[PDB]
């Protein structure tokens, strides 16, 4: 699976190793080995979420086929980033094997 | 709606409050309430657009039910071009827009 | 075509002009005029790839309008380009292909 996290938290305000712990959490939540989970974190962006520029984060999850998981990812992200659930949005994307290189 | 804007303009050359004004613009253009509009701006990137590295921007727009036909998208893009060329001081030829329909189940 | 490259290499360690050379390389590999090739490079990110945070890169390729043989050859040549330019092992690079139709282009 591929996880992409955009956030407007400055890079020097994000917990060190977030990408590694999010990788481990997604492995458990999605039932996959950690070495098949890929995580990309992009901090320091300019973001409006639900029309507000308050601190927020967007998570995208892509996997083969169609994939609550949302509840578990909210749990982890609220704890790591101190963001309320109202400041986080999650999207899921299906892939087909021909798209993998 | 979800709007994602990549640009090679430095952050200091992106006008303050752009993400908020693009929010209101997208709500009017797409016919969605502002509290459902999400904007992500990623400045300072390294970009080539149409083979040139001069200042440029790429905008991606994703939404349920509204960006699924050429007739719909031609109408939306005209309004988004007029807004971005004014805000970013870029020529129309330096901006590319892509539309992605979302299916309802994809929202977590 | 649209190429987007995410990497956790700090911007200062990405070779200068990478986006120009990737543009030219992609035109040759994908068989498209260079003026139809768009490249976006996002460096300095935080990434875990195959469970490791060692330097890595992800390349996404979207084209308007492949065979298994075609995309297999494209992937191999993009691996060759990225390992040379970024000094990464092949195990530190992932590639994804995405479909696009003309009605999606403004
Ligand atoms: Na539609």
Token pair of B81 as six digits = 């071009």
What CA–CA distance (Å, rounded) separates A14 from A29?
A: 22
First CA to last CA distance, chain C:
14
Token pair of B47 as six digits = 């970009």
- Best mutation target, B20, B38, B43, to test chain A (most A CBs within 10 A): B38
Contact A76, A45 (CB under 8 A): no
What CA–CA distance (Å, rounded) separates B78 from B85?
A: 11
Which residues of chain C lie closer than 8 angstroms to A11, CB-CB? 44
Q: Give which of B42, B53, B54, B51 is closest to B7, Cα–Cα.
A: B42
Taking the centre of ligand 1 as the mean of its atom positions, its distance from the CA of residue B101, in whole angstroms, is: 7
Which helix (H) or strand (E) segment holds residue B24: the answer is: helix B18-30
Per DSSP (E only), the strands in chain B are 2-7, 38-42, 46-48, 57-64, 95-102
Token pair of C104 as six digits = 């999606």
What burial class does residue C7 get, using C-beta atoms within 10 Å of its C-beta: 0-12 exposed, 13-18 middle, 19+ buried? Answer: buried
In sequence order, what DSSP letters do the residues of A29-91 get, joined into one string? HHT--GGG-EEEEE-S-EEEBTTB-SS-EEEEEEEES---HHHHHHHHHHHHH---GGGEEEE
- Look up the domain containing A66 and give its range: 2-99
Contact A6, B39 (CB under 8 A): no
Domain count of the fold of chain B: 1
What torsion do the CA atoms of B63, B57, A100, C1 make, to the nearest 10 degrees? 110
What positions of C carry a catalytic annotation?
A: 1
Taking the centre of ligand 1 as the mean of its atom positions, its distance from the CA of residue B71, in whole angstroms, is: 9
What CA–CA distance (Å, rounded) separates A90 from A94?
A: 14
Residue of B nearest to A7 (CA): B40
A46 phi-psi bin (left φ>0, alpha ψ -120 to 50, beta other): beta
CATH of the domain at A86: 3.30.429.10
What CA–CA distance (Å, rounded) separates C95 from A35?
A: 16
Q: Would you give the distance in Å from CA B93 to the centre of its chain? A: 15
Do B34 and A51 lie within an 8 Å CB cutoff?
A: yes
């Amino acid at each position: 699976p591929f996880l992409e996290l955009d956030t407007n938290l400055p890079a020097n305000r994000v917990p060190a190793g977030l990408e590694k712990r999010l990788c481990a959490a997604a492995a458990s939540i999605l039932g996959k080995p950690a070495d098949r989970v890929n995580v990309t974190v992009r901090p320091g962006l300019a973001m409006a979420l639900s029309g507000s520029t308050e601190p927020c984060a967007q998570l995208s999850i892509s996997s083969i086929g169609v994939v609550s998981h949302s509840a578990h990812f909210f749990e982890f992200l609220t704890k790591e980033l101190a963001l309320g659930q109202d400041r986080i949005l999650i999207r899921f994307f299906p892939l087909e094997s021909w798209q993998i290189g």
